Write a protein that binds this DNA or RNA. Structure first.
Lengths: 232, 346, 346
DNA sequence: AACCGCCAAAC
DNA sequence: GGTCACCAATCCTGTCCCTAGTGGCCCCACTGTGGCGGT
């Protein structure tokens, strides 16, 4: 349930495997209300490759990434490509588009993203797939589902200690906080329909409407985590 | 020349599948069936009794008198059955003239010219004789060959009927009778035509008739099981499922094809052995490659020097006393065999 | 001599299935069939009554008088049938001259030279006599041997016809009659020629004719079945299926092969018993290996000293009065049996 | 600058 | 001209074994099927 309930394992391989499984979107969200510093170390160590990291609780190469403002810049470049609906599924040829919208109207008889709170996935460019993991990985705060950008947007004072515990400056931290809060995912609707996006004709007021179906990250992530639990 | 990214050849010879059967007064096709027998085998291996350093293992005195339980498939001739019949069909196509795939049009045009020059020299005649000779002596019976007095009967789509009365009298190197050479001459001409003319459709129906001994053992194709359970048989046979619901014990198509293309004895000037046509001339008994990669006798070394071999072929018809280079005979045996002879883009 | 990772020999002797049958006035082959019968089996074993410390088990007074239900197959001669017949075919090939597979070429040349030297000593004659003697005395009937007056009739592919009048008069060690020694001499020369000449195709048809007692029990090959259900027969017989759906009760070819190759009494100087040719000389009656891995008498220890044994055979041709070493007679009996005699690369 | 490089791991 | 008679019955007593064992060697394919930012 809690972060350091899984840190009790003396074997680092089993620990890091369980931690990497815990912070992946195909499993349940772990509570980090007690553990904010250690949470930041592992979340910022997830930004590296698997074969580049021996242990996720190594503090120094986390500070190597954090002190390097060519590393965190890439992680805040990847926030603009945070979707509620994946346009690159299953065809990846849908070129440089991002759909971020509120869930639709709730219906009693059908299931959609309206039946869950608004969560975000990422889809831009495979080269930066690790750089998203810092700011898109979902965790449990106090008693509330949250990700790093949303929890650093308003409630920064709770994370000041956790961020300054490594030796980050106040100037850099507050400039990082305002640029992250300014670079939060807006209501992104593409200006043009892509060549590889599937369109259909549905009967509208006195004619037809062009409809592009896009999957929701939330319903997919729920079906994935339901499938790993072997429930259906 | 340079080897292309894509360089395919379709095979020219198409053996169907050799099925073992016998005949009664009632039926002209009764399939020879295998049955699972559970026998008692001893512990006779090196590793049962010795370490890798040739020192005796620490075992009980009664351990080497213990047995292994063997689950094997057996095929015997039923009692008082006189003859056993092995039958397969053979189709011959002209697929060695033109590559099936080729990336470089300079390579494609060169290989098309080489085949046409080899055709007018009468090179396909010599290759057709060696394929035909393997059919008449019964190389394709493998371990059933010359176990009894075997009669081979061949019916071609032209309407020709050929008969070898006894295969025990014939060999590869032995001096044949006048009638047996006439069968070799006429059938080789029909295969050569099929190998060279794309317009010609040619097929043969080949049947062996072996004088069976009393409850004689048959040796068909065995399937390749690398891992086996304790219930199922460690030795299993290739089977042809008949139209009713019975399994005739069978040879693989590739097994029959391996026998017909056992023609390669050009690898040495005084070579006694005929290898199955391979790019590196693999000898499975001795466990060596008779055409190593370091040598110039391997296929890929000969195939890149095809411009130099095309020069020698064009001086062949002008004399027609000097014979064709055995490297060129081996070359066209690999193209008839077919395959994918592709390097890569560097 | 170093054991290579490929070292292969095909067996030289090819017995088929041996089939039990009788003859009527109308039919020349009536198959002897087995039927399932259920009998009472009393609790007679040690473990039925006693613990492993030789103390009585705490069971009922009455339960030792209870009887297990046995489901067995029995084969009896039908009433008033005078004679029963057992026949098999024997093919002989020359496969001990050269290994079927050999990785090391220096090993191949040595084993080829050894076989040629052993042939010129007249060593294949001695082995052929022992194989022949097992056919004439009827060792291959196993438990049906000398249960009546048995006549053995042998027809070879050369056109020879040999007849043993009564096998009860013959033994391995006994002094034979002049006519019986003539049959042993002539048939041994035919087997020797088949063991040594690859160009010869030799086959025999061997039939035993036993004067049956009234409803006498037949003892064919039993199937090795550990996985037996409650309803099924605990004792099942090996059967040859006829052209019509009748099952003749039969011996395994390996069972017949085990009888002919019961020739090994070289393991001791005054050895009375003849073992089935084994790499470690396994004796299941005594439960010991007569050629243990500790000794130099086992196959692999003798096969490692081949160059030393070749030197001894080279003192044959000029001398020809000294006998061949018993180790070399045993060596060639294992190569005639054939097998996989290899060791991993190191 | 057109073309070699970066990037993942479930049961 | 057409159908295949009713009335009840399925036996109880005891048990399915012991011994020993399921092999070595070698191998499991080459071709193609990428979006995106940058030096």
């Amino acid at each position: 349930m809690h972060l350091k309930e899984l840190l009790e394992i003396t074997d680092t391989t089993e620990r890091d495997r369980s931690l990497r499984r815990a912070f992946s979107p195909y499993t349940a969200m772990i509570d980090i209300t007690g553990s904010e510093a250690v949470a930041l170390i592992i979340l910022l160590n997830l930004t590296y490759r698997k074969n580049q990291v021996d242990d996720l609780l190594d503090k120094k190469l986390a500070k190597q990434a954090l002190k390097s403002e060519d590393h965190i810049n890439k992680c805040i470049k990847e926030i603009a490509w945070f979707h509620t609906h994946n346009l690159k599924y299953p065809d990846i040829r849908v070129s440089k588009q991002n759909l971020a919208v509120e869930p639709p109207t709730l219906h009693s008889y059908v299931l959609s993203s309206a039946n869950y709170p608004k969560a975000y996935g990422w889809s831009h460019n495979s080269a930066k797939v690790n750089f998203a993991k810092l700011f898109v990985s979902y965790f449990k705060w106090q008693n509330q589902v949250s990700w790093l950008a949303q929890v650093l947007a308003t409630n920064s004072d709770n994370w000041k200690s956790a961020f300054t515990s490594l030796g980050l400056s106040v100037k850099a931290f507050k400039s990082l906080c305002v640029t992250v809060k300014n670079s939060l995912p807006e209501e992104a609707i593409p200006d043009s329909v892509d060549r590889y996006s599937r369109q259909i004709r549905m009967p509208y007021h006195d004619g037809y409407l062009a409809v592009t179906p896009v999957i929701s990250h939330v319903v997919q992530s729920k079906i994935q985590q339901a499938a790993i639990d072997k429930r259906a | 020349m340079e080897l292309c990214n894509i360089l395919k050849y379709d095979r020219s010879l198409y053996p169907g599948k050799a099925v073992f059967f016998y005949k009664t007064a009632d039926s002209d096709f009764v399939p020879l069936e295998a049955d699972i027998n559970k026998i008692r085998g001893p512990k006779s291996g090196f590793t049962e009794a010795f370490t890798p350093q040739f020192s005796p293992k620490n075992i009980s005195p009664q351990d080497l008198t213990h047995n292994n339980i063997l689950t094997l498939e057996e095929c015997y001739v039923p009692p008082n059955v006189e003859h056993i019949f092995c039958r397969f069909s053979l189709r011959v196509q002209a697929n060695s003239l033109v590559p099936s795939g080729c990336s470089d049009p300079e390579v494609f045009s060169l290989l098309k010219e080489l085949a046409e020059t080899f055709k007018e020299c009468g090179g396909y005649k010599e290759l057709a004789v060696r394929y035909c000779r393997n059919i008449l002596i019964g190389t394709w019976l493998w371990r059933n060959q010359n176990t009894g007095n075997t009669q081979i009967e061949i019916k071609t789509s032209k309407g020709s009927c050929y008969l070898i009365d006894n295969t025990r009298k014939l060999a590869w190197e032995s001096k044949w009778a006048s009638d047996d050479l006439k069968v070799l001459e006429e059938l080789s001409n029909e295969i050569e035509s099929a190998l060279t003319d794309p317009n010609v459709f040619w097929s043969a129906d080949i049947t062996a008739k072996i004088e069976a001994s009393f409850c004689q053992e048959i040796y068909p194709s065995q399937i390749l099981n690398d891992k086996v359970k304790q219930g199922e048989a460690s030795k299993q046979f290739v089977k042809a499922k008949c139209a009713d619901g019975r399994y005739a014990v069978s040879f693989n198509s590739v097994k029959i094809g391996a026998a017909l293309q056992s023609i390669d004895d050009w690898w040495d000037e005084d070579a006694s052995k005929r290898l199955r046509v391979h790019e590196f001339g693999a000898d499975k008994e001795i466990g060596v490659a008779r055409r190593p990669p370091d040598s110039e006798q391997n296929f890929y070394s000969i195939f890149k020097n095809t411009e130099w071999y095309l020069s020698a072929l064009k001086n062949c018809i002008t004399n027609k006393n000097e014979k064709i280079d055995p490297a060129i005979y081996y070359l066209f045996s690999v193209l008839i065999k077919g395959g994918m002879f592709q390097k890569k883009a560097e």
